[PDB]
């Protein structure tokens, strides 16, 4: 992008989380965590 003053930078992440697997439980990253409260209740019933 080209804002006023002519300074520009690439539109991408500085750094990212260490795993994307379905077991993931990240406190800081809703976009990389896979566990959820519905799944916790679904797994409770079906594991019983």
């Amino acid at each position: 992008v080209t804002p006023s003053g002519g300074s520009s930078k690439p539109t991408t992440y500085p750094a990212l989380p260490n795993s994307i697997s379905p077991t993931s439980d990240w406190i800081n990253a809703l976009t990389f965590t896979n566990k959820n409260n519905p799944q916790r209740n679904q797994l409770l019933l079906r594991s019983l």
Partner: protein, 187 residues
Amino acid sequence: DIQDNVNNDTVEALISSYKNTDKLKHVYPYRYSGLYAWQLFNWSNKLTNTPLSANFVNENSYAPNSLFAAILNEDLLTGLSDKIFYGKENEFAENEADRFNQLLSLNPNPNTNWARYLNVVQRFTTGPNLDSSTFDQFLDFLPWIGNGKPFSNSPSSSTPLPTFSNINVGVKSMITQHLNKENTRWV
């Protein structure tokens, strides 16, 4: 990993200009992305702090997929009228011009009574009184009925790993390099 960065200079091209109207709406030139929890957090029929609020509903289950128990208003179950009356406040939009400016909520009409029936439940429960990953720890603690062994695997190098919780899986490291690189030391 390849989501478009809004940064702060970027927003003016991708969202910070496209104002909607009573007949005009937009689809943005922005690469949205996220995993299963972010999908459900945005578009599941989630509970909230006030009733009738959930604007998104997907589809309904094949079979029962939750435990459930509840406390009922035995008085209100006795007091409610035999016949429920719905009205135009529960109809879908008759044509798409009424769908574009679609009303999210309405007061009951003078002849209708459906809103009285909403409050027959006082309280409900669904599982252990546990919060966050602590609940996945309970899921790992209970024995599988086919062999009497807990999914946590700890009661016996090269030992096996648990299935539900993340404790002792892989390796420890500090989250100080993630996302904003801030607050992690104290909050």
